[PDB]
Subunit: 138 residues, 6 copies
């Protein structure tokens, strides 16, 4: 089925699922990555950069798991986003050193949450072509 | 009946009710929880974090009670939110060390108030599944 | 008649009226009260808090009186808001140490003003039930 | 005729008129007056306060006169706003120590300008009733 | 023909034209002029003030010329805006010591640019009446 | 075909293409260039200035390549934007010392990304006329 799916396992919680077997349906995503134009003398690109990905999802059985990880600073052991479109896989993201840094959960005004994850290493792969990019990986 | 309900008791005021017996009908909620990506050396997660929950409700007989607690820094002894949806219980939140930190009460432009509560320990439980998360609890 | 009414007397000006006899019809109100989560060591709640109430009203014969009080830092000797709804009294607010801190008066774009009052002590009373709250009073 | 009119004379320019004889038709006004809740020890109310009135008007023959006064810091010798409504005079404002502090002139997106005036002394008078207020006057 | 026209010559580039012969059709303008209420002791009005005029225009053959002047800090030798309305000349602006300080060029979302010019001396003249104002001129 | 096209090669990645042969179709662009009015004593125009161009595009096979370059601070060896309109070439931009400084990639709320590039030298050329501008080039 078409759309955005997350495959995630916490370092202490283990596999986090919703109700693409084992994957959580994501309603929307925004990957935001910032690099200053001027690199501080002697500073690594990675330390200068800020990568965050915000996932919007229906509140579900994973919602307690994410909420706990946030407060306990639990790292995600596995974090992979796969995007399907008309049928076929389009994009695969993978992220390393993933920490949850913000959650908002809210009612209608169904129940929705926005979860923001900060990461270090990343990978994006265009499936049809096989072109991939990665930085700060392993 | 479907929707968001609060069960609350003040440490000095005692049980706070409106007109789900003993529970206050809440129109909307937003649970906002922030964790810095970089943890200050020697700082607890809890001290780095900020958890707030904002409740929107019709002004009612509890409105004076909340307004007083706010000005007197009265802690909530009990603070539990239960969310029902089509029929059935979906989610239970519990919060510890609950202090009211902001209120806005206002006319049409019926009478509505937004109440913001800061907390320390929290719990969220997905009812159907029993999956729960908690941090900084007791 | 239904709506929001103010009963106000200045310490030097005396009773301030418009054209609920002696009360000023208010179009809208917003009571905003802020309490920091962390209380500075040795600081009173009252000094940490900020209470303001903003009243929206048609410009009228009281408009010069409020405008003068603002510039002269005249305290309100009496300041009571009463809210009526369908018929019956709903809520009574009373405020102490009331100073006007901001006015905006403006044309259509009838003549309207927004008046912001800062206070110390406050009271809110739910009429039907008699439940009341107050802080920093007398 | 109904609406907002300005009567103004510059200290060096003399009488400033448009095409209520001698008065400039104003499209809109906003009188904004701010008083800090806490008065700095030994500070006059007037020095703590900020009064500004913003007038919106069609660009006209007075537009060069206001634009020049702004750049030359020319004080207004006379500055009176009169407001007429259905027929009859409603309100009279008078301002002292009037300096122009901001102009924006702009095309359709007819030709319009917003002019912001800072003042010290002020007066507002409700015509029908004769109730007046003033502060920091002469 | 009605509207806003610019006559401009760069100090090094010479005359800058588009496709009112020799004048560039401007879609919109905003002249923004700021004067602080308090003049720093010993500071000229001109140094305290900030005058900027923002011109919105279709991208055209002048677009490279303005873009270059911006990066090279080239002063405009001539800068005159004339505004025609129903037929007849309404207003003439002239500006001295004109430097381009910001450009945004952008696609539909035809090709449009917003160009912001900072100036020192200025003049505005109401044509029908001949009333003029100027400050900081020559 | 009409619209905005990018021709780009990374210094390490080589040619970056999508699915105007070899050019990437761009949905929208915004070239933003800022020059302070006051040039710091002894500072070059280039160091005072900030030039950025933001490109909006469908996520595609180039998306991994741009995302990697961003994190690795890879400079673009070639960066040329060409704009076609009704049929014919309108504008050519060229940029030097191009670094990617920000990306946002996001879902519908197809898959879209906004990519912000900072540059030093630039050129813009109006094709029909041949008028060109450039600063800080080679």
């Amino acid at each position: 089925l078409a759309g955005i799916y997350l495959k995630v396992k916490g370092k202490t919680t283990g596999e986090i699922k919703g109700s693409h077997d084992g994957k959580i349906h994501i309603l929307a995503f925004k990957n935001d990555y910032d690099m200053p134009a001027r690199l501080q003398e002697g500073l690594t690109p990675a330390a200068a950069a800020r990568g965050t990905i915000t996932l919007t999802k229906e509140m579900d059985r994973s919602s307690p798991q994410f909420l706990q990880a946030l407060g306990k600073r639990e790292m995600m052991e596995e974090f992979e986003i796969t995007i399907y479109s008309p049928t076929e896989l389009l994009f695969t993201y993978k992220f390393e050193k993933v920490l949850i840094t913000h959650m908002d959960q809210y009612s209608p005004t169904g129940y929705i949450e926005e979860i923001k994850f900060t990461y270090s290493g990343y990978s994006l792969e265009h499936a049809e072509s096989g072109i991939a990019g990665a930085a700060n990986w392993k």
